[model samples]
Target: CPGIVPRSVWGARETHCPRMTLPAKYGIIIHTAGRTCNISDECRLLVRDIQSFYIDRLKSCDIGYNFLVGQDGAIYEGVGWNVQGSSTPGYDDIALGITFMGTFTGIPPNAAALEAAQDLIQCAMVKGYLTPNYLLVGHSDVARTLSPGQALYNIISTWPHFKH
Candidate 1:
């Protein structure tokens, strides 16, 4: 399996961010408000749900996060690496939003999902989407909500790029 799943594979519609300035400065993590998935198929369902909500209901340009991770250890593409995300309100251009596909306020992300996220970040750096010194933080860092959730935040806080 590819380390990262492309948007095409997941049946994504158009309405992309078009172009973005390379070498993003941050990677922000988030969760899907209790809609976590564990298997690969479930992950796809989760993607569809988000697309419907963001694209159809909320009427956003596209699915918000730059990528979505499932506990099944799979990564689903959102807006892709070079494009900006609709994830966070103000910081969308500067940060890559990586949302885990579930709520983690009580339960921590599975081990596989965590490792997949780490790999995704490293890959983003190597591909020039993110600078080597890019910052990593939970959504709560910039937004006024517990997005990534407390459980996942507890672990990501100790990571290298985390800022407060």
Candidate 2:
């Protein structure tokens, strides 16, 4: 399991929301579609900014994603295990939303970010938050937007359990 950066460490605001059903059946990949950070300090600030956006602008219960990966090879906890995410609208209750911090329309994230996301999936399974045979998909697979982007989607399409 990969080490997760806790919400408190990232200076996230306090918010409570209902939990999702455990051992989620789907794992959705997403991309920030915004800035990219390569170091811990930048990544931490980026995560905080995302949380603020989700709360203030989006009026979400909290940060939308279940976990976020940075190019620095760090996994930042969002809503955390067993919690419903607001990232994917329809599938929030049944899926774990893992977002990469950056726009990936033209270029995919660096190797460290990719590896961190993969490790996070393994961690979720081991922690009993995600099913072993969970279906992996890019956000665009279930949503109308081109999330996860073409470049990143192309890569995750080859990962285990990914389906059209």
Candidate 3:
């Protein structure tokens, strides 16, 4: 959880202004629905690429999610704690988004990402950035789309914090 690869490591561009719209009342799981990256270089590149998409296309403050989990199991820091991310439309108003870097429609993400995600969630809870009883749900649970894909959603939906 603590081993997050900082923005400097992945080459994130300077942001307009990132603010922590704290205390996140929910934890929303997301999946990039993009290609997978098995190696560190590819994984870090994926983070940079996604950041570019958010900044240039979405006109976001920074990379949307608070955290990113690569297939290589590295946790890349995005907008990070307190900063309201520009991820799921409705849920971004109250949740911290943690997105996995692969589609995960058929195959699941690597075990390291799963563990890192869990640990990040726990760290969030422990740090009080998120409430101890924070709700955890897949992006599809709130938005119109299906995300955090079925494979990842299936597992997280059974966790203690998942609401629906």
Q: Which candidate is the best by TM-score?
A: 2
lDDT of 1 by residue, 53-119 (tens): 8877888878778788888988898877777877677888888888888778988988898999888
- Full ranking by TM-score: 2, 3, 1
lDDT computed for candidate 1: 0.81
Between prediction 1 and prediction 2, the one with superior lDDT is 2
Whole-model lDDT for model 3 versus the true structure? 0.82
Candidate 2: worst 10 consecutive residues by lDDT? 81-90
Model 3 segments beyond 4 Å from truth?
Answer: none
Model 1 misplaced stretches (Cα beyond 4 Å): none
User: On residues 1-164, what C-alpha lDDT tens digit does candidate 2 reach at each position?
Assistant: 55788988888888999898888999999988998999898889999899999889988889889888888988998988768998676798899888998899999998888888887787778877788788988898788898988999999999888887
The number of clashing residue pairs in model 3 is: 3
On a 0 to 1 TM-score scale, where does candidate 1 land against the true structure?
0.92
Worst 10 residues of 3 by lDDT: 14-23
- Alpha-carbon TM-score of each model against the true structure: 0.92, 0.95, 0.93
Off by over 4 Å in 2: none
* Model 2 residue 163 lDDT score: 82
Ranking by lDDT: 2, 3, 1
In candidate 1, how many Å is residue 29 off? 0.6
